[PDB]
Amino acid sequence: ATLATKKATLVAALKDLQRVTVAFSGGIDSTLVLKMALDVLGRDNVTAVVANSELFTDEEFDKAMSLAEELGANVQGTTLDYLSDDHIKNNTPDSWYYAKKMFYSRLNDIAANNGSAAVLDGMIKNLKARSEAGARSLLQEADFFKTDVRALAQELGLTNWNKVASCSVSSRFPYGTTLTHDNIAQVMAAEKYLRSLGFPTVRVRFHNDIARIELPEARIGDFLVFNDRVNRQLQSLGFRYVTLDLGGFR
Amino acid sequence: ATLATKKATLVAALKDLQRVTVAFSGGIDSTLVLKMALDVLGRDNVTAVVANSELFTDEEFDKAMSLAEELGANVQGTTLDYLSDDHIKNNTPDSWYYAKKMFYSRLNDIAANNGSAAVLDGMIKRPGLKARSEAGARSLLQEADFFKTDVRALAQELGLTNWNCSVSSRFPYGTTLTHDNIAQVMAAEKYLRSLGFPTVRVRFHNDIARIELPEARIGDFLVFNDRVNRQLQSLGFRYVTLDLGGFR
Amino acid sequence: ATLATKKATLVAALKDLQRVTVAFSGGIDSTLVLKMALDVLGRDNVTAVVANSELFTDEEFDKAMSLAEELGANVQGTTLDYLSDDHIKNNTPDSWYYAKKMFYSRLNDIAANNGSAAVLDGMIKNARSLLQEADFFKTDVRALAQELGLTNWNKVASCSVSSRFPYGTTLTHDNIAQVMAAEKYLRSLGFPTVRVRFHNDIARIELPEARIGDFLVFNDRVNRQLQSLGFRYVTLDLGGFR
Amino acid sequence: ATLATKKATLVAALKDLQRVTVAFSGGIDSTLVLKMALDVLGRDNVTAVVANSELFTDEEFDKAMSLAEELGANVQGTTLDYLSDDHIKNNTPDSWYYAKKMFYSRLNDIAANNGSAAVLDGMIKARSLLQEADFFKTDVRALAQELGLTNWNKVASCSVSSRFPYGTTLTHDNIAQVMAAEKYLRSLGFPTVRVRFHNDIARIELPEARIGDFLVFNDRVNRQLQSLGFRYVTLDLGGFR
Amino acid sequence: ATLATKKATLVAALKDLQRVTVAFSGGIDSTLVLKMALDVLGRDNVTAVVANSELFTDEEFDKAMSLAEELGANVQGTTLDYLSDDHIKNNTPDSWYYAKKMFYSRLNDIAANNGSAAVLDGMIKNKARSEAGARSLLQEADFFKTDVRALAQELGLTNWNKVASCSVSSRFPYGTTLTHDNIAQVMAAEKYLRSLGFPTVRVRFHNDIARIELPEARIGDFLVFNDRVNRQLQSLGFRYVTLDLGGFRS
Amino acid sequence: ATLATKKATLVAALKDLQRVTVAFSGGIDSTLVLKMALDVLGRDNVTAVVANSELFTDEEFDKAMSLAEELGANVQGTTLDYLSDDHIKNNTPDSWYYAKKMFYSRLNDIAANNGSAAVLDGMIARSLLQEADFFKTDVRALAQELGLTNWNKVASCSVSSRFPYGTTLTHDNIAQVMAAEKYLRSLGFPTVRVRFHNDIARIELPEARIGDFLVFNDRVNRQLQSLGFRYVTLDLGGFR
Ligand SMILES: [Zn+2]
Ligand SMILES: [Zn+2]
Ligand SMILES: [Zn+2]
Ligand SMILES: [Zn+2]
Ligand SMILES: [Zn+2]
Ligand SMILES: [Zn+2]
Structure with missing residues (x-):
């Protein structure tokens, strides 16, 4: 499939959803997701959500918040108490699974109250809690790779994102x-x-x-x-x- | 309506002056005003003026003018001998103030001859009156209470990507x-x-x-x-x- | 003149040639030529050639190929035996000429088989060098590249x-x-x-x-x-x- | 006040006990006292004692003899075993005290069998006559160099x-x-x-x-x-x- | 030529003055002069003087003081306010001259009150002083830098300020x-x-x-x-x- | 193994020799050797020799001609033309050997004329410091004990x-x-x-x-x- 085929597939998927909620971190892929969503559906039908918590710095939060305003989107922050779940508080190898399970849960309730039909992240084709929330990874179900997401990023003139994939x-x-x-x-x-x-x-x-x-x-x-x-x-x-x-x- | 109105009040003010001269430094807000002026009045009703002086390198002048000349605006450079003012020469704590006085005087001289109605700068937010207020210069992004986020919003919204002691x-x-x-x-x-x-x-x-x-x-x-x-x-x-x- | 002027002369020159081959190395100057040629003629009328040889690392060859499909071009590699020329193998001061002659010869052979009007390189001010003919300086190619939205290129010069x-x-x-x-x-x-x-x-x-x-x-x-x-x-x- | 009056203070002090035992370690302070003992008491009356243990280097021990022997002193090495003590082995904040007490305990014994009048250490401002003669850090350095002393452990082996x-x-x-x-x-x-x-x-x-x-x-x-x-x-x- | 002939001329010069005041700084030269003066004339006929002033540390004074004591000489300190002279207070290029004119004046007053026949400094072959009548016996006996270290070795002199201070x-x-x-x-x-x-x-x-x-x-x-x-x-x-x-x- | 035994062992050996010639390089070792030979046998019984050659810096040569005269010994300089020998000129892995042989042949020729019983160096030809079982610890100890302060600090190879x-x-x-x-x-x-x-x-x-x-x-x-x-x-x- 060509870059034109999978952007066309991506556009077809977005048009079917009319209103979506995007999990935005400032990354190369979420930015492409947030940018494509605004270009296809419009600012008045796209709600970007950035997560704030003690596990990430407020500098990365304040920055990823404004990268989405620079993209021209209606952006909203939400705070998560990750240490309220002991599975996260005890720092076990699977603590990150429960973090995203709690993260994808908050996004769905926002998706209910705002009127969105799905939750979109920037996951590519190259995991677990992503399915139960019904979160959709449009880039990957359209067969994008990191070489494909970079190609479409230049074509849409996107140069400013974060290279620091924060931990x-x-x-x-x-x-x-x-x-x-x-x-x-x-x-x-x-x-x-x-x-x-x-x-x-x-x-x-x-x-x-x-x-x-x-x-x-x-x-x-x-x-x-x-x-x-x-x-x-x-x-x-x-x-x-x-x-x-x-x-x-x- | 916040923004929608902050941009609407600006478009109304720009429409009201018809012909404008814009003090341009290359920053965010000077680029935003100059672009808004061309999108509302057209190049034949907008002049961008960039100052050259010995108090700045021979380099940033070539860049700020290069940038407005890249935007597609009739750009004029004017050179000021700031050292002619004794407050600037002897470097008093208000030397910045008398530098603006000299620049806004030159701008209104430029604006009087090309037929402009006002001088515009991209100001957002001491020895006497405000140098802008003393010269009659209009700060339209201030007046509209644009905050920095509002400036940040619009440049991407108008497509501005290239912008700049x-x-x-x-x-x-x-x-x-x-x-x-x-x-x-x-x-x-x-x-x-x-x-x-x-x-x-x-x-x-x-x-x-x-x-x-x-x-x-x-x-x-x-x-x-x-x-x-x-x-x-x-x-x-x-x-x-x-x-x-x-x-x- | 202004940057928008030298862009037009670059577009007017590219439209007169209609079909071109582009010598691609991955740097700032050859990426701009490739992106400009593509945005005027399309993937159909542009071929990017990346050279693989002993004198340049395989690291730069693999990335330069990768950057060219990423910009949306049909990319063809070709291998050069610089050491098969005795002037290069013995490292005479004339090595640059026979190296350059051997490289440009191979590219015009590629350009003839695909029907290209000319071979493009990314030589700038201070084969046809379109950027140089339109008076592009180092400061100009930085501006035009950010305007088009180009980002990932080899930042360290290859030698x-x-x-x-x-x-x-x-x-x-x-x-x-x-x-x-x-x-x-x-x-x-x-x-x-x-x-x-x-x-x-x-x-x-x-x-x-x-x-x-x-x-x-x-x-x-x-x-x-x-x-x-x-x-x-x-x-x-x-x-x-x- | 002067370095001469401070030197004459321990010359008279050492010449009243006439038979001593020096806790030699290698530092400049215990090097100063033992030489000051041999000059006023002679090789026959001075006894140099060195404590080898599990808390110190073989190296600060080995050259503590090569020096002690080269001053012309009747050197003899003992071996102490801390860590078998209950307070020292666990490094409770009092271990320094038992290490001192257990150290000073045997010197008291050794000095006994040697017909000595007192034990001496290298403390400055047992018997610390460098402390009694009011020797500071600068007064020990000047008297040591004046006596032609060149060899001593100059990094404090703790x-x-x-x-x-x-x-x-x-x-x-x-x-x-x-x-x-x-x-x-x-x-x-x-x-x-x-x-x-x-x-x-x-x-x-x-x-x-x-x-x-x-x-x-x-x-x-x-x-x-x-x-x-x-x-x-x-x-x-x-x-x- | 030999070291013994130069020592002989120095010995005779000291025997002729009998009572001397010595300008003592702690250098190898003033140490050699002071040591020889004690050996030839005796303790009660030699007075070592160290200058104390605002223009030097209190510690070079304290060190030069003890050095004179360790050689076995009566040493006394004298205080000078060099800053009472306008040439010194304004730090003129010729301030060095007026500084030692004042230093050599105070010494001669001491040499007058204690009965000395001359004032001695430690100057060798390689201004203000002459105008004061101070005597440089090492210079008069033709001592060079190497002859100082020779005679210092013969006398067992091993300790002195190796750094002359400014x-x-x-x-x-x-x-x-x-x-x-x-x-x-x-x-x-x-x-x-x-x-x-x-x-x-x-x-x-x-x-x-x-x-x-x-x-x-x-x-x-x-x-x-x-x-x-x-x-x-x-x-x-x-x-x-x-x-x-x-x-x-530099 | 006190310091007085070895200082005595050295002067005892110095005593047997009677008349000596000392290879003086300027280091602390050849200095301790030279002064002791002066202290025990006298100036007319000691001949300090300093080698001048292209293999060693003139700064080292000028320093040692002064320090040895500074010590009261009657010095004699001698010039060694190492590069005449082609093993030293072409620097073979055994060219060190022909240098020591040129050097020690010359000083043995000198010691014979001035009537010396032996040639001495400062190793830790006779090495009296080595024979008395000196160490670097005892060489500074005895040096200061005699008033030795000045010597070449950086030993030159x-x-x-x-x-x-x-x-x-x-x-x-x-x-x-x-x-x-x-x-x-x-x-x-x-x-x-x-x-x-x-x-x-x-x-x-x-x-x-x-x-x-x-x-x-x-x-x-x-x-x-x-x-x-x-x-x-x-x-x-x-x-x-
Ligand atoms: Zn002027
Ligand atoms: Zn660095
Ligand atoms: Zn360092
Ligand atoms: Zn004062
Ligand atoms: Zn020379
Ligand atoms: Zn080699």
Whole structure:
């Protein structure tokens, strides 16, 4: 199938729905989904939803919120208490499944109250909780790949999205560590401070009384001028010891 | 109706002046006003004016005009000798104010001869009256209470994708600006930028150059210490130095 | 003149040719020619040719192919034996001419079989170079590209590997592969612009001067890895990149 | 007030006991006292004692003899065994006291069989006559150089118990792991260095003025300390002290 | 020619003056002069004098004082306010001259009251002083730098200030008025930088500007202290604290 | 094994010798050897010899001719023409051996004339410090014990190790290497090697100083290029 065949299939699917709710993160694929939806159905029939929670930073939320206004869509934020589900709070390998199960549930109730006929995400063809909510991945059921979504992104003149596929803060705690409101706010504030110093790719691992910072090895040399400030700032967030991993990022 | 009305009040004001001259700097709001003026009045009723001066590099002028000339508007450049004003020459804390006074005076002179009804700038939100108010300039995006989000909304909605400091901020308050020392500072910053340091300030302190850099680059800067010391010394500085506080 | 003017001369020239072949490498300048040719003639009347050869890495060849189907073009690869010419294999100062002659000869043979009016390259101001004939400077191609919505292109300039060997050095398959593996390893550490100059038993690493500080955390790993690649001494040029 | 009156204070002090036992360690302070003993009491009346244990290096021990022997002193080595104590092995915050008491206990015995009048240590401002003669850090340095003393341990060899947190019990595998890391790090050219043990994590404390010079050894220390047992190897941003 | 003939001329010169006052700084030269004076004339016929003033640290004074005591000589301190001279207070190029004219004047008054026959400095073969009548016996006996270390070795002299220090006036450009507060703030700045591990350091005073001069090979090791040195010297009175790219001196 | 035994063992051996000739290089070892020989046998019984050759810097030679006279010994300089021998000129893996044989033949010829019983050096020909079982700990101990403060701190190796085996040593390419190392030490790097490789200079530095060296890269590049090198590089393996 050509790029023209699958955009045509994508247009046929959107036209059948008239009114949709789009799960928007700022990503390459969700932006293409949000952009195609507005171009086919219109601004007055597309509702974009961006999720806010403690597991993601508010900087990524505030940014993905405005990327959708830059796309010219009616955007709406919703907040989720992920730690209300213990399966998420206990930080088990399947905690991310229950996060999206709770995420796809909130989208459906919004899809009911706004009058939308389906929930759209930006999942491509190259998972579980995506089906029970009836969420539809239009890009994948039209046989798109990452090479296809990039092609249609240039054709629609889309150049501004996010390259930082942000990760849940739970990856900063070893499996089995109980997440709390305060230790999550402890990690995110330390990562926000380090990012403001000029280090966009950074991890602050949580080791009880120890913070273990992960930087790209080719940036550790540039980090030297900040040792004393990061030490005291992170001590003032609760960490007793502030360290920097010699093994680098991941 | 919020936006729908914020854009409607603007279209009404633009329709009301018929012919306009637009002070253009390349920023978001100057690009937004100029585009709205051409979409409502047409090129033959809109003039974009870009200022050139020694207080800015020979580069940003070539870019701001290149951008409005790319939008398809009759663009005029005008050069102002800001150093003719003693408040600007001796760099007083209100030197910014007397710079706008001089620019808005030149604009109304340009607007009076091409037949425009008003001068427009893209202002949103001290020694006397507002320089805009003193010159009769209209800030239509202010009047419509456009907030930044409203500006952000429309440019994408009208298709605008391409859009963009005075050199006086390199000198202390009270220090006299000369044609030589401005060339001195600007040549110093141009060289440092060519070494791979885009964001840089060379603060002028008579015989001392105080280099401000993002603190996360000072490590990457040490290979150039001796070359930067000798280059700036040949630009007229006796001492070439690096601020430990960094940029800002 | 204005950018919209040089765009029209570029469109008027492309419409007079109707059917063209485009020498595609993946950089900013050849991506703009390919996208402009496609947006004036369509996938039917444009063929993109990407060259595969010993002097350029297979990394750049695979991506350049990938970027060309992504822009919506019918892409054809072709293989060039630069070393089959004795002038190139012995690395004379004339190597650039026979390399260029061999490359452009192959492309006009491709353009003749598909009926193209001319062969296009992306040469700019300061075969037909349409961008240069319309007076496109480096600052102009950045503007027109953002206006069209182009994004993913090879940001680091590609260069023939013959520049890593002294003039008069006979290029073999071993030493070329040796320099390739060295430069490839250095890029993976986080250094996209780098040269490994070949001097028999000595590797001379050329880095941009603003990155040498950031490089010292890698000194030992680079020394060991290039030593296992064949070099006896792994050194860092104090002069820097070029 | 002067260094001369401070030297004459311990000359008279040592010449009143006439037979002593010196807790030799290798530092400049215990090197100063033992030489000051031999000069005023002679080789026959001075006894140099050295404590080998599981909390110290073989290296601070070995050269503590090569020096003690080269001053011309009747050197003799003893071996003490902490960690068999209940308070020291668990690193409770009182372990420093029992380590001291158990140390001072046998010296009291050794000095007995030697017909000595008092035990001496190297404390500054048992018998600490460097503390009684009012010797500060600067007065010990000037008297040591004046007496022609050139050899002493110039990096303070502390007790390995300070590398462990309060509550963690110390093992033959705990200490050897930590002491092997500090030995490896010092071999790279960093003489003042600590390796704090926190189970899976190693916490390196270097002088801040050396951390810039430490970058070139980052990966090698990461791999080596991972082979000694540590899962993570980190550099403390606060530094040494 | 031989060291013994030069020692002989020095011995005879001391025996002829019998009672001497010695300008003692702690260098190898003034140590050799003081040691020889004690050996030939005795303790009660030799007076060592160290100058204490606002233009030097209190610690070089404290060290030179103990050095004279460790050699076994009666040493006394004298205080001079160099800033009472307008040539010194305004820091003129010839301020060095009026500084030592004042230093050599105070010594001669002491040499008058204690019965000395001459004042001795430690000047070898390689202005204000002559006009004061001070005697340089090492110069008169033709001692060169190497002969000083020779005779110092014969006498067992091994301890002395290996670093001759300069007056803080070198931290102020010519024409600057020296005051009791900017003297102290410059000395506190240098005293603090040395505590970080930088023994060779200059803090050049430019009113609102501090121009730190460091050995160029130490600058890399210095980046970790940038922020702490910034705030410390700002609390001392400097608005801008800066690092000279030329390095120590130049 | 006190220090008085070994100081006695040394003067006891010095006593047997009666008259000696000392190979003086300037280091602390040949200094301790020279002063003791002066302290025990006297100035007219000791002849300090300093070798001057193209394989060692003139700065080292001038320093040792002064320090030895500074110590009260009557010095004699001697000039060694190593490059006359073709094993040393062409730098073979055994060219060190012909150098030690040229050196020690010359000083043995000198000791015979002035009437010395032996030639002595400062190893830790007689090595009295080695025979008395000295160590570097005891060499500084006895040095200060006699008032020894001044000696050459950075011990200089033979410049032959800067040239690969097979390279022909010449007057110009030796001056090249020696000028480059003098410059690198004046910047604040006492332990440095500049390996010769025709058009390439391969600087060797301790790995703990490579960061402190960054500020000098450009000035070292152009200085060493004005001395004859086309490419100036830094060895990533560091010193040795
Ligand atoms: Zn003018
Ligand atoms: Zn960097
Ligand atoms: Zn070789
Ligand atoms: Zn360093
Ligand atoms: Zn005063
Ligand atoms: Zn000479």
